Amino acid sequence: PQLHYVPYDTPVEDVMRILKESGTLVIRNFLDQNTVQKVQDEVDDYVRNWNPGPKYNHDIKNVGSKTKQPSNLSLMSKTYRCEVLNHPWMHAICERMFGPTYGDYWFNGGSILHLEPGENTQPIHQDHVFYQISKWRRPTDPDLTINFTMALTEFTVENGGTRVCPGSHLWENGHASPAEEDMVPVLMQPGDALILPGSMWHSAGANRTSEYRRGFATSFHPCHFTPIESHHHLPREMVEEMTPLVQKMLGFRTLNLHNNVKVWKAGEGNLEDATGL
């Protein structure tokens, strides 16, 4: 297994092969320069006023003192919720990853990944560690989550670009963390995206440049799992402008399981019916 840089027009069966083989890859030109600049324009004041460091106390202390990870992106970015969440590559991969086992999937969470100059290396980790059921899951099973880390600024070795350990997703539970010397930094242009299944060991690097390294992420997981981020605080007019696909992603529609059982229902009917969506 190795790091792979594939173009946008890669066949889907080739991408899922690399995900099955190496557990990660980079899709170049995942977004265009227009979407990158629009996302930066919408979250500029948000991230600037956000305070560096975690917001609350939890066990996985992987938020550095010089790191900003604001979420709430569907609420603070129109391009995020109207276009980014409808990205065909995300839904093409998510359908083949969760479909045959869980049925529907929806949005788990998504945050800005902002590395201030001088930030040290993030601890190497798997994204699904905050799932208690990850101890039950064998590495042959489908992943509990998948992440889409999109570069807004450049991602270099020196400015703290994300590093992955290809092949570490196939390790059995309890396997020790990969050594730092085994981490492989990811080189990305603005708009490129690194695909991170919940089982791939990875971490942010140290930002040893004079300029911040900023990315932003989306993540999806099976519909039977509670998302880290709710969206019932969003204004009603926002939901009605969302596509039906994004409405389901953000928790406003009933979800169907793989055997046609429904969860997230309003009584016995659909949640969208009782709300008038």
Ligand X SMILES: O=C(O)CNC(=O)C(=O)O
Binding residues: 69, 122, 125, 127, 162, 202, 213
Does 223 engage in binding with ligand X (CB under 6 A)?
A: no
| 162 binding ligand X? (CB under 6 A) | yes
Stretch in the footprint of ligand X (CB under 6 A) among 87-95, 131-139, 173-181, 198-206: 198-206
End-to-end CA distance of the chain: 45
Distance CA 264, CA 47 (A): 32
Running DSSP on this structure, what letter comes out for residue 261? -
Contact 187, 157 (CB under 8 A): yes
**Closer of 87 and 241 to ligand 0I3 (Cβ):** 87
110 is a contact residue toward ligand 0I3 (CB under 6 A): yes
* 144 touching ligand X, by CB under 6 A: no
Q: How far apart are CA 46 and CA 71, in angstroms?
A: 10
Identify the sign of the CA torsion 204, 210, 212, 213.
negative
Binding test (CB under 8 A) with a second copy, winner from 48, 49, 226, 237: 226
Q: For residue 110, give both structure tokens.
A: 């998504």
Please identify, using beta-carbon distances, which residue of 203 and 254 lies nearer to ligand X: 203
Contacts of 218 (CB under 8 A, 6+ apart): 84, 85, 87, 90, 107, 110, 147, 148, 150
Residues at the contact surface with ligand 0I3, assessed by CB under 6 A: 60, 62-63, 108-111, 125, 127, 129-130, 145, 147, 217, 219, 228, 261
- Given the rule CB under 8 A, which residues bind a second copy? 55-60, 69-72, 75, 101-102, 130-133, 136-138, 141, 222-233, 251-252, 254-255, 257-269, 271, 274-275
